[PDB]
Amino acid sequence: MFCEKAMELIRELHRAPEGQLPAFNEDGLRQVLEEMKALYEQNQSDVNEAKSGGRSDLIPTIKFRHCSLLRNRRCTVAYLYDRLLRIRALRWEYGSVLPNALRFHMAAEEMEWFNNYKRSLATYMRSLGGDEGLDITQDMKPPKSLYIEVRCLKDYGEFEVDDGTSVLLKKNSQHFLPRWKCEQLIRQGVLEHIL
Amino acid sequence: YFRVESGALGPEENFLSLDDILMSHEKLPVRTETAMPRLNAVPQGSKLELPLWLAKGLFDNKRRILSVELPKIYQEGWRTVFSADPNVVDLHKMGPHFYGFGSQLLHFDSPENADISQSLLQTFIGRFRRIMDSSQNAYNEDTSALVARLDEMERGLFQTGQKGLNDFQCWEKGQASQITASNLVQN
Amino acid sequence: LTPAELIERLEQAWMNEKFAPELLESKPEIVECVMEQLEHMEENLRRAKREDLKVSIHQMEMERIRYVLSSYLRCRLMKIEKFFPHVLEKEKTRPEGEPSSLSPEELAFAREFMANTESYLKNVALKHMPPNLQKVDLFRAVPKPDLDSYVFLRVRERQENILVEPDTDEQRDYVIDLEKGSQHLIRYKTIAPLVASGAVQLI
Amino acid sequence: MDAAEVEFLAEKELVTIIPNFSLDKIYLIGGDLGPFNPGLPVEVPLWLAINLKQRQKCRLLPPEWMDVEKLEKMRDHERKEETFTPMPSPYYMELTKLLLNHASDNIPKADEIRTLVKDMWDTRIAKLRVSADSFVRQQEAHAKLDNLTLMEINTSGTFLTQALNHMYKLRTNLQP
Amino acid sequence: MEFSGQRNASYPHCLQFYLQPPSENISLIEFENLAIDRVKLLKSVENLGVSYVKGTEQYQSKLESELRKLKFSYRENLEDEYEPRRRDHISHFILRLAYCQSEELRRWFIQQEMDLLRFRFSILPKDKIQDFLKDSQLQFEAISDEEKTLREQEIVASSPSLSGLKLGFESIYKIPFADALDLFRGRKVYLEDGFAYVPLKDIVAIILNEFRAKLSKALALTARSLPAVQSDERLQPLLNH
Amino acid sequence: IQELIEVEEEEEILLNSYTVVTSFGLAQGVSWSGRGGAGNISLKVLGCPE
């Protein structure tokens, strides 16, 4: 039945509710566009034949083709929009710059969309008030104390604390730092909040 | 991640909802009322099975192209069985979206609408207490025996109950203040 | 007016925004005033020596305020991104003298989001469709806020002759009165003017 | 709303401390505090009281309702009544946890008090269960809640309102 | 939690005593057949009497079938028995006029009424007794019930008819010897210092006696006051035949 | 008739988609009309004792 090639797109995303992003399927998308083109050509041919021959009993088959086209459009558009939702989540989890391992799954146009979104969102935050606004993507949990103790999980480069002062994030080194500087590195998975 | 919600219980499906897209794929039995060419032809009177989306598309209120009938599980023989004790029946071996699909058959203006509505409402009220007690009270155990028979709509309520339980137990045992990584824990 | 009351008003707006199923009306005055308070206090701590006890107390106070402001603004932004055609069209329709649901910066962000999303879909799939199917209407595709949601509330001023409609048969309609300091569970659609007017609080 | 946020609200309640140092009056956005003198009591919000206690800078004094004689009478009255009774503090559960974890050294008969407060939580939660079930069986449209606290609402509330949304949709469907 | 959201007052019990006039309307055939079916019932009570001994289980079992067949009030039901109760009330008022035509006919229908009342009082569960004695004017207050066991000894020693079990299941309360008039003047049972240790059936006898007195006054009123109502009397010969 | 017209409209659209005796009070000379009931009109019935 005419729906089946489109359902591959839908059924993939439905199987994974965790928000994680699968690889962009190209051949299924092309196949749906080709299928719709074929159905359109057949319907146009029968329409002009019915109109020129003066023959009425073709009308039910014409309606039959018409609704099939709209079903195919709904399946493909519904598939694209969900990927946009999964992409938007990566800005608010993780951070401003994505890891290359994860960018491998996005299409070119998806990268265009993501960069536009970052530019606009950064413009909004900068305008909130005072000078240079407020980064509302932080303070995700209600605050209990000024300072926290953190343990490094990965060998990482130099980390700047204030002006020229910096610390070296070698694995299993341990530091006592103010909470507001560590918060994003803990979220990305570089550091561990002990005790 | 703002998943688009299902519309099924209302007067329309949500256009972009994945669940409504899957649910509307289900097959429905019909009778053909006018002969159809180039499908060779299908003669008038032929009995068929075809998807719900297509049946709604072709059903003009004149009933000029086709006429529709209820599947067995929504007819009187089965409604009588649900009425005995609704806790025992397996609404996952029935169609996985029982209430959602059942609510959309009222569109076709059958004389049995008044009975279908009462069937669905009474089934829901009958099943409610078990979902409440079992979701709220099962802590750090194998739930697979409990969630086995639940419809897709009912499963959402089970998950919400479990989530609410877990949060309080974290808070009481002092684990709630720690900062941690989100869904990127995959990597 | 006095700073204590300003903070109390912010913490009231926070909870109304959490539980209401729509985008409630804007509060530009509160945001501007709270922001300048934080700027002022920062400079005052910057001018004093950093070793003292009372300085640490002041810093803790500022963290508690900044968290509420951030949380409130994040929630409003979720609702803008989720219902973009509807909030845009409603603002376009609004008559003079009635308050807007959007601050100017929020409206700017919404317009950018609308344009960006349409462009992506058009370039990826719709230009390849047959000529009769290249247009789609996002105003129809995107769902609407569900005002029949149930909510808990607490009343701050007495109210009288509120109509409750079970089902939708007029034979079951009846009226109730909301006494000072009581708490109730009821559908959001019936109480919506009371929340906007400030007569009740959602909890 | 999470338990963390409900606790964030509970931390605004005022408590009495005895400092072991001296400091002038201090002006905050939320109000004026002090002056602080050694060996003499002063009122401060709970978030400040806990912090000074951890850094060994003061002594906590139990609130006047934290008393075995008072709590026994309250428990018995709660068990007897057919509805929710009014409570000694709107944030009784949160205050109990915070004070008894940090300040057991200053609060006598702490392990008696834990059991008395646990009993009240167990009774009130049971009443809420019965009310929810009765709401759905009778297909009711409105209810009244005059003595429930915000933690008790927040624990079980999300489930109930989620179920009522669906039920209201099923019963209306024959009349678009 | 606390939630928010007519004919009951007419007959809270199946028992009724005709104090209030039903101030409403009736059809011709309605009042006709309401009365005539009860005429059949009056004859039927004594037909059952000639069939076998009064008030036995055979009587009880057949009698309730008559009521179910004849749609008048019952052992009290929780559904709409108020309709049979008002039918019984209305038809009772209608029955006052037919057999007032002769005192022998008056006494005849009174006697089957006493038999019917005795049957109904025999059927009564405990809750009926408890609520009707308080909801009616038939109060008859009890005094110092703890002494009943001293009378469990004394009555049992002092009475051929009564027994220790009857003290409890024909539950004993204290009222005067005169409310047990036939028992004092026959000297049949333990009564002391002018007081009787009384079960419900004595108060039933008093109920029947005051019912007879009030009904006799009503029958006198029926004989006297009725002529303004007598614009139609066509049924009276068929009723007295 | 009308049903066939609507059927033909659907067909055409679907196919083309792929391509004075007494006077009082000096009534005369004045124009005679109402506001169609659109003014502040009100109607109320009176009676005594009812």
Swiss-Prot record, chain C:
Residues 146-203 are annotated as: Important for GINS complex assembly. Transmembrane segments: none annotated. SUPFAM superfamilies: GINS helical bundle-like, PriA/YqbF domain. GO terms for cellular component: CMG complex; cytoplasm; GINS complex; nucleoplasm; nucleus. Induction: Significantly up-regulated in aggressive melanomas. GO terms for biological process: DNA-templated DNA replication; double-strand break repair via break-induced replication; inner cell mass cell proliferation. Coiled coil: none annotated. InterPro entries: GINS_A (IPR021151), GINS_bundle-like_dom_sf (IPR036224), GINS_Sld5 (IPR008591), SLD5_C (IPR031633), Sld5_GINS_A (IPR038749). It is found in: Nucleus; Chromosome; Cytoplasm. Its main location: nucleus. Gene3D superfamilies: 1.20.58.1030, 3.40.5.60. Pfam families: Sld5, SLD5_C. Keywords: Acetylation, Chromosome, Cytoplasm, DNA replication, Nucleus, Phosphoprotein. Belongs to the GINS4/SLD5 family. Required for correct functioning of the GINS complex, a complex that plays an essential role in the initiation of DNA replication, and progression of DNA replication forks. GINS complex is a core component of CDC45-MCM-GINS (CMG) helicase, the molecular machine that unwinds template DNA during replication, and around which the replisome is built. This is DNA replication complex GINS protein SLD5. It comes from Homo sapiens (Human). The gene is GINS4.
Swiss-Prot record, chain D:
It comes from the Eukaryota. The keyword Acetylation applies. GO terms for cellular component: CMG complex; GINS complex; nucleoplasm; nucleus. The keyword Ubl conjugation applies. There is a cross-link at residue 109 (Glycyl lysine isopeptide (Lys-Gly) (interchain with G-Cter in SUMO2)). Its main location: nucleus. Belongs to the GINS2/PSF2 family. Component of the GINS complex which is a heterotetramer of GINS1, GINS2, GINS3 and GINS4. Forms a stable subcomplex with GINS3. GINS complex interacts with DNA primase in vitro. Component of the CMG helicase complex, a hexameric ring of related MCM2-7 subunits stabilized by CDC45 and the tetrameric GINS complex. This is DNA replication complex GINS protein PSF2. It comes from Homo sapiens.
From Swiss-Prot, chain E:
Coiled coil: none annotated. The gene is PRIM2. The RNA:DNA duplex-binding domain interacts with the template phosphates at positions -2, -1, 1, and 2 positioning its bases -1, 1, and 2 for duplex formation. Interacts only with the beta- and gamma-phosphates of triphosphate moiety of initiating NTP of the primer. The interdomain linker provides flexibility in movement relative to primosome platform composed of PRIM1, the N-terminus of PRIM2, the C-terminus of POLA1 and POLA2. Together with POLA1 interdomain linker, allows for large-scale conformational changes of primosome and coordinated autoregulation of catalytic centers of PRIM1 and POLA1. It is proposed to move the C-terminus of PRIM2 close to PRIM1 during initiation, then move it away with the 5'-end of the nascent primer during elongation. The lineage of its organism: Eukaryota, Metazoa, Chordata, Craniata, Vertebrata. Belongs to the eukaryotic-type primase large subunit family. Changing residue 96 to A: Decreases primase affinity for POLA1 by 30-fold. Changing residue 93 to A: Decreases primase affinity for POLA1 by 40-fold. This is DNA primase large subunit.
Curated annotation (Swiss-Prot), chain F:
Belongs to the DNA polymerase alpha subunit B family. It is found in: Nucleus. Accessory subunit of the DNA polymerase alpha complex (also known as the alpha DNA polymerase-primase complex) which plays an essential role in the initiation of DNA synthesis. During the S phase of the cell cycle, the DNA polymerase alpha complex (composed of a catalytic subunit POLA1, an accessory subunit POLA2 and two primase subunits, the catalytic subunit PRIM1 and the regulatory subunit PRIM2) is recruited to DNA at the replicative forks via direct interactions with MCM10 and WDHD1. The N-terminal 240 amino acids are sufficient to mediate complex formation. Component of the alpha DNA polymerase complex (also known as the alpha DNA polymerase-primase complex) consisting of four subunits: the catalytic subunit POLA1, the regulatory subunit POLA2, and primase complex subunits PRIM1 and PRIM2 respectively. Within the complex, POLA1 directly interacts with PRIM2/p58. This is DNA polymerase alpha subunit B. Phosphorylated in a cell cycle-dependent manner, in G2/M phase. It comes from the Eukaryota. It comes from Homo sapiens.
